[PDB]
Amino acid sequence: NIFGNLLKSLIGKKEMRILMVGLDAAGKTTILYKLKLGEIVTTIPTIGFNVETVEYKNISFTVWDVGGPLWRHYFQNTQGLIFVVDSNDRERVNEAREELMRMLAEDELRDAVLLVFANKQDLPNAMNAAEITDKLGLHSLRHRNWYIQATCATSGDGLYEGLDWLANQLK
Amino acid sequence: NIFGNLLKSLIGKKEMRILMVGLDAAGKTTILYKLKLGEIVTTIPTIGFNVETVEYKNISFTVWDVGGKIRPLWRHYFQNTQGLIFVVDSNDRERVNEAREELMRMLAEDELRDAVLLVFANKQDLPNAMNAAEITDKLGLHSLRHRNWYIQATCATSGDGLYEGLDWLANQLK
Ligand SMILES: Nc1nc2c(ncn2[C@@H]2O[C@H](COP(=O)(O)OP(=O)(O)O)[C@@H](O)[C@H]2O)c(=O)[nH]1
Ligand SMILES: Nc1nc2c(ncn2[C@@H]2O[C@H](COP(=O)(O)OP(=O)(O)O)[C@@H](O)[C@H]2O)c(=O)[nH]1
């Protein structure tokens, strides 16, 4: 209930998309499943391009992996961008940084609010939120409304606080 | 829908359960999407265990990745399963032997003793793909002395070969 309750004010007619992306194995499917806002439906609109969507009324959460095109069609009604990083994966945090910056430079996403989930904080030497803020260069983002939330998606810790912040921004 | 028409001999009151498994990246989600038998729904029944499901009438297609142990929740799926589809990336010579081991561990599971096995040698459009005869030997299918099995070469992205294999599977499950 608590997640559907966050979107009560955004309920309406204009369909707004929340896009949640990050490297493979960051935790994005796990997060979608923890929202309990509807079934996770997988589509393949182009060969090689797997998309996961949960449609709750006029709000859609759309997920895909970034990291080593047709994406431009999704950006139109995208009001929020959630980037999920595996805070335990130090080998690939520089690649995450490169994919985040590549998303933020899309002109079709220039007015989008950015929520960063620093996920897998339960793991013994996960990087904390301040450290991920450094590795991702978030303080260098000067004209973006952003926020970083430390999370453990398997237990749900932090998901509500992150999404509460985001819904407030889209108000 | 050709695949809907193919499966019609199987429609009834009793829930037909087809399991499609394989190593990650074998092409299983692509196959499910190509069948056009309804939406692919992902659930996570237990931590770390992503299951994809397509429900067509009384027929359910369930998918998950193997590779890396048989859990008890797996055995529960096994108990109600009539067909096992094992999908192999035919171009992944590095991991074919792991695919063999995972298929053999499943087939030794007593809950699956009566299940019909269909192997998809997928990704045949790629130039170094192992053909069906080589996958047959790599996977040890001829050493299955009590199992009803069939192997079908496929290219799941074009959708070709899938009909022939499911045709065979449906006829066995009849
Ligand atoms: N330890 C830990 N594992 C997680 C967490 N979130 C997700 N996972 C695991 O990471 C793996 C991949 O997660 P998944 O949601 O499929 O990632 P995706 O590829 O981004 O969709 C699974 O084994 C999940 O259980 C977390 O906060 N802590
Ligand atoms: N060349 C080729 N690629 C394929 C084929 N089938 C699937 N793929 C691709 O292999 C990758 C994994 O496919 P997917 O269905 O997600 O694999 P899964 O992890 O088993 O679900 C994707 O990039 C697919 O587009 C095929 O017959 N040929």
Side-chain angles (χ1 to χ4, degrees), chain A residues 47-48 50, chain B residues 23-30 65 122-123 125-126 155-157:
Chain A
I47 281 160
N50 271 28
Chain B
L23 306 181
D24 67 295
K28 306 186 300 295
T29 306
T30 301
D65 293 346
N122 196 30
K123 303 275 182 77
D125 55 306
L126 295 169
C155 167
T157 44

mmCIF file of all heavy atoms in Angstrom, chain A residues 47-48 50, chain B residues 23-30 65 122-123 125-126 155-157, ligand 2:
data_model
loop_
_atom_site.group_PDB
_atom_site.id
_atom_site.type_symbol
_atom_site.label_atom_id
_atom_site.label_comp_id
_atom_site.label_asym_id
_atom_site.label_seq_id
_atom_site.Cartn_x
_atom_site.Cartn_y
_atom_site.Cartn_z
ATOM 1 N N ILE A 47 15.412 -6.782 -31.078
ATOM 2 C CA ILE A 47 16.348 -7.866 -30.799
ATOM 3 C C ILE A 47 17.399 -7.353 -29.838
ATOM 4 O O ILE A 47 17.959 -6.276 -30.053
ATOM 5 C CB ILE A 47 17.031 -8.405 -32.072
ATOM 6 C CG1 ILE A 47 16.110 -9.355 -32.830
ATOM 7 C CG2 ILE A 47 18.324 -9.098 -31.730
ATOM 8 C CD1 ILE A 47 16.503 -9.527 -34.275
ATOM 9 N N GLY A 48 17.671 -8.105 -28.768
ATOM 10 C CA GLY A 48 18.714 -7.752 -27.828
ATOM 11 C C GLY A 48 18.328 -6.766 -26.739
ATOM 12 O O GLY A 48 19.146 -6.509 -25.853
ATOM 13 N N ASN A 50 15.939 -6.063 -23.781
ATOM 14 C CA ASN A 50 14.965 -6.628 -22.843
ATOM 15 C C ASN A 50 14.483 -5.498 -21.945
ATOM 16 O O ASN A 50 15.301 -4.878 -21.262
ATOM 17 C CB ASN A 50 15.555 -7.724 -21.963
ATOM 18 C CG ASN A 50 15.460 -9.118 -22.580
ATOM 19 O OD1 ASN A 50 15.450 -9.282 -23.812
ATOM 20 N ND2 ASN A 50 15.366 -10.135 -21.718
ATOM 21 N N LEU B 23 21.405 -22.420 -18.928
ATOM 22 C CA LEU B 23 22.313 -21.385 -18.445
ATOM 23 C C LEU B 23 21.820 -19.984 -18.823
ATOM 24 O O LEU B 23 21.042 -19.792 -19.772
ATOM 25 C CB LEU B 23 23.714 -21.598 -19.010
ATOM 26 C CG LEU B 23 24.417 -22.941 -18.829
ATOM 27 C CD1 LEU B 23 25.813 -22.885 -19.463
ATOM 28 C CD2 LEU B 23 24.492 -23.266 -17.358
ATOM 29 N N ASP B 24 22.257 -18.989 -18.051
ATOM 30 C CA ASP B 24 21.928 -17.613 -18.389
ATOM 31 C C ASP B 24 22.418 -17.327 -19.799
ATOM 32 O O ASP B 24 23.432 -17.859 -20.240
ATOM 33 C CB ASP B 24 22.532 -16.636 -17.381
ATOM 34 C CG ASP B 24 24.048 -16.601 -17.449
ATOM 35 O OD1 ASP B 24 24.657 -17.650 -17.129
ATOM 36 O OD2 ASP B 24 24.598 -15.563 -17.856
ATOM 37 N N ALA B 25 21.658 -16.521 -20.526
ATOM 38 C CA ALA B 25 21.968 -16.070 -21.887
ATOM 39 C C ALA B 25 21.725 -17.117 -22.977
ATOM 40 O O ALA B 25 22.093 -16.892 -24.127
ATOM 41 C CB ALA B 25 23.427 -15.615 -21.997
ATOM 42 N N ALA B 26 21.124 -18.254 -22.660
ATOM 43 C CA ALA B 26 20.861 -19.277 -23.659
ATOM 44 C C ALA B 26 19.797 -18.836 -24.683
ATOM 45 O O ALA B 26 19.712 -19.445 -25.750
ATOM 46 C CB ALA B 26 20.419 -20.548 -22.952
ATOM 47 N N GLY B 27 19.022 -17.785 -24.389
ATOM 48 C CA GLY B 27 17.908 -17.358 -25.225
ATOM 49 C C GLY B 27 16.491 -17.734 -24.768
ATOM 50 O O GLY B 27 15.557 -17.706 -25.586
ATOM 51 N N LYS B 28 16.285 -18.043 -23.477
ATOM 52 C CA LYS B 28 15.004 -18.560 -23.031
ATOM 53 C C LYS B 28 13.903 -17.505 -23.057
ATOM 54 O O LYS B 28 12.766 -17.790 -23.477
ATOM 55 C CB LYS B 28 15.166 -19.167 -21.632
ATOM 56 C CG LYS B 28 16.275 -20.213 -21.550
ATOM 57 C CD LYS B 28 16.321 -20.897 -20.175
ATOM 58 C CE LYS B 28 16.569 -19.847 -19.060
ATOM 59 N NZ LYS B 28 17.963 -19.269 -19.292
ATOM 60 N N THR B 29 14.192 -16.301 -22.544
ATOM 61 C CA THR B 29 13.210 -15.217 -22.572
ATOM 62 C C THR B 29 12.839 -14.857 -24.003
ATOM 63 O O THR B 29 11.660 -14.665 -24.309
ATOM 64 C CB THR B 29 13.754 -13.985 -21.834
ATOM 65 O OG1 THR B 29 14.159 -14.354 -20.496
ATOM 66 C CG2 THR B 29 12.669 -12.889 -21.768
ATOM 67 N N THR B 30 13.830 -14.835 -24.905
ATOM 68 C CA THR B 30 13.592 -14.571 -26.325
ATOM 69 C C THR B 30 12.618 -15.586 -26.902
ATOM 70 O O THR B 30 11.720 -15.213 -27.652
ATOM 71 C CB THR B 30 14.894 -14.632 -27.130
ATOM 72 O OG1 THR B 30 15.814 -13.672 -26.629
ATOM 73 C CG2 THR B 30 14.638 -14.359 -28.617
ATOM 74 N N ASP B 65 17.044 -19.715 -14.736
ATOM 75 C CA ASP B 65 18.427 -19.989 -15.097
ATOM 76 C C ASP B 65 19.010 -21.051 -14.166
ATOM 77 O O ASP B 65 18.770 -21.024 -12.945
ATOM 78 C CB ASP B 65 19.294 -18.741 -14.979
ATOM 79 C CG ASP B 65 18.931 -17.683 -15.982
ATOM 80 O OD1 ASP B 65 18.202 -17.973 -16.946
ATOM 81 O OD2 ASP B 65 19.365 -16.549 -15.795
ATOM 82 N N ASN B 122 20.173 -23.686 -29.575
ATOM 83 C CA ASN B 122 19.819 -22.351 -29.987
ATOM 84 C C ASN B 122 21.032 -21.582 -30.517
ATOM 85 O O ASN B 122 22.166 -22.018 -30.360
ATOM 86 C CB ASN B 122 19.243 -21.618 -28.803
ATOM 87 C CG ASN B 122 18.527 -20.435 -29.219
ATOM 88 O OD1 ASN B 122 17.979 -20.422 -30.320
ATOM 89 N ND2 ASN B 122 18.609 -19.375 -28.424
ATOM 90 N N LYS B 123 20.758 -20.467 -31.212
ATOM 91 C CA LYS B 123 21.786 -19.554 -31.763
ATOM 92 C C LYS B 123 22.500 -20.168 -32.971
ATOM 93 O O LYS B 123 23.685 -19.916 -33.217
ATOM 94 C CB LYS B 123 22.812 -19.197 -30.695
ATOM 95 C CG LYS B 123 22.461 -18.545 -29.346
ATOM 96 C CD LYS B 123 22.333 -17.087 -29.251
ATOM 97 C CE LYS B 123 22.036 -16.603 -27.806
ATOM 98 N NZ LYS B 123 23.104 -16.531 -26.751
ATOM 99 N N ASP B 125 22.215 -19.416 -35.968
ATOM 100 C CA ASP B 125 22.590 -18.403 -36.959
ATOM 101 C C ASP B 125 24.029 -17.903 -36.825
ATOM 102 O O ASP B 125 24.490 -17.184 -37.707
ATOM 103 C CB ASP B 125 21.675 -17.180 -36.843
ATOM 104 C CG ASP B 125 21.661 -16.608 -35.393
ATOM 105 O OD1 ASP B 125 21.391 -17.387 -34.447
ATOM 106 O OD2 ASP B 125 22.004 -15.422 -35.177
ATOM 107 N N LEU B 126 24.733 -18.213 -35.732
ATOM 108 C CA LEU B 126 26.096 -17.701 -35.548
ATOM 109 C C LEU B 126 27.107 -18.656 -36.164
ATOM 110 O O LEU B 126 26.921 -19.867 -36.105
ATOM 111 C CB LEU B 126 26.409 -17.521 -34.076
ATOM 112 C CG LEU B 126 25.522 -16.448 -33.438
ATOM 113 C CD1 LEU B 126 25.631 -16.433 -31.940
ATOM 114 C CD2 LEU B 126 25.841 -15.043 -33.960
ATOM 115 N N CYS B 155 17.022 -20.890 -34.177
ATOM 116 C CA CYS B 155 17.439 -19.483 -34.113
ATOM 117 C C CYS B 155 16.262 -18.730 -33.495
ATOM 118 O O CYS B 155 15.326 -18.337 -34.197
ATOM 119 C CB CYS B 155 17.820 -18.930 -35.477
ATOM 120 S SG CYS B 155 17.967 -17.071 -35.449
ATOM 121 N N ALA B 156 16.272 -18.534 -32.166
ATOM 122 C CA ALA B 156 15.064 -18.014 -31.505
ATOM 123 C C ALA B 156 14.747 -16.579 -31.916
ATOM 124 O O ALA B 156 13.602 -16.133 -31.769
ATOM 125 C CB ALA B 156 15.171 -18.055 -29.973
ATOM 126 N N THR B 157 15.746 -15.809 -32.362
ATOM 127 C CA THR B 157 15.459 -14.431 -32.748
ATOM 128 C C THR B 157 14.667 -14.343 -34.056
ATOM 129 O O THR B 157 13.890 -13.390 -34.248
ATOM 130 C CB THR B 157 16.767 -13.647 -32.858
ATOM 131 O OG1 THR B 157 17.733 -14.440 -33.556
ATOM 132 C CG2 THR B 157 17.301 -13.261 -31.454
HETATM 133 N N1 LIG C 2 22.387 -14.615 -32.524
HETATM 134 C C1 LIG C 2 21.334 -15.058 -31.661
HETATM 135 N N2 LIG C 2 21.086 -14.440 -30.500
HETATM 136 C C2 LIG C 2 20.059 -14.876 -29.740
HETATM 137 C C3 LIG C 2 19.283 -15.963 -30.136
HETATM 138 N N3 LIG C 2 18.360 -16.173 -29.163
HETATM 139 C C4 LIG C 2 18.555 -15.258 -28.211
HETATM 140 N N4 LIG C 2 19.565 -14.454 -28.551
HETATM 141 C C5 LIG C 2 20.140 -13.322 -27.840
HETATM 142 O O1 LIG C 2 20.954 -13.879 -26.566
HETATM 143 C C6 LIG C 2 20.802 -13.013 -25.590
HETATM 144 C C7 LIG C 2 20.030 -13.659 -24.373
HETATM 145 O O2 LIG C 2 18.720 -13.921 -24.759
HETATM 146 P P1 LIG C 2 17.667 -14.187 -23.528
HETATM 147 O O3 LIG C 2 16.278 -14.658 -24.016
HETATM 148 O O4 LIG C 2 17.505 -12.986 -22.648
HETATM 149 O O5 LIG C 2 18.520 -15.294 -22.674
HETATM 150 P P2 LIG C 2 18.050 -15.952 -21.273
HETATM 151 O O6 LIG C 2 18.952 -15.420 -20.132
HETATM 152 O O7 LIG C 2 18.131 -17.440 -21.396
HETATM 153 O O8 LIG C 2 16.610 -15.518 -20.960
HETATM 154 C C8 LIG C 2 20.060 -11.758 -26.216
HETATM 155 O O9 LIG C 2 20.962 -10.791 -26.630
HETATM 156 C C9 LIG C 2 19.296 -12.477 -27.315
HETATM 157 O O10 LIG C 2 18.904 -11.432 -28.323
HETATM 158 C C10 LIG C 2 19.617 -16.569 -31.371
HETATM 159 O O11 LIG C 2 18.910 -17.650 -31.866
HETATM 160 N N5 LIG C 2 20.637 -16.107 -32.080
#
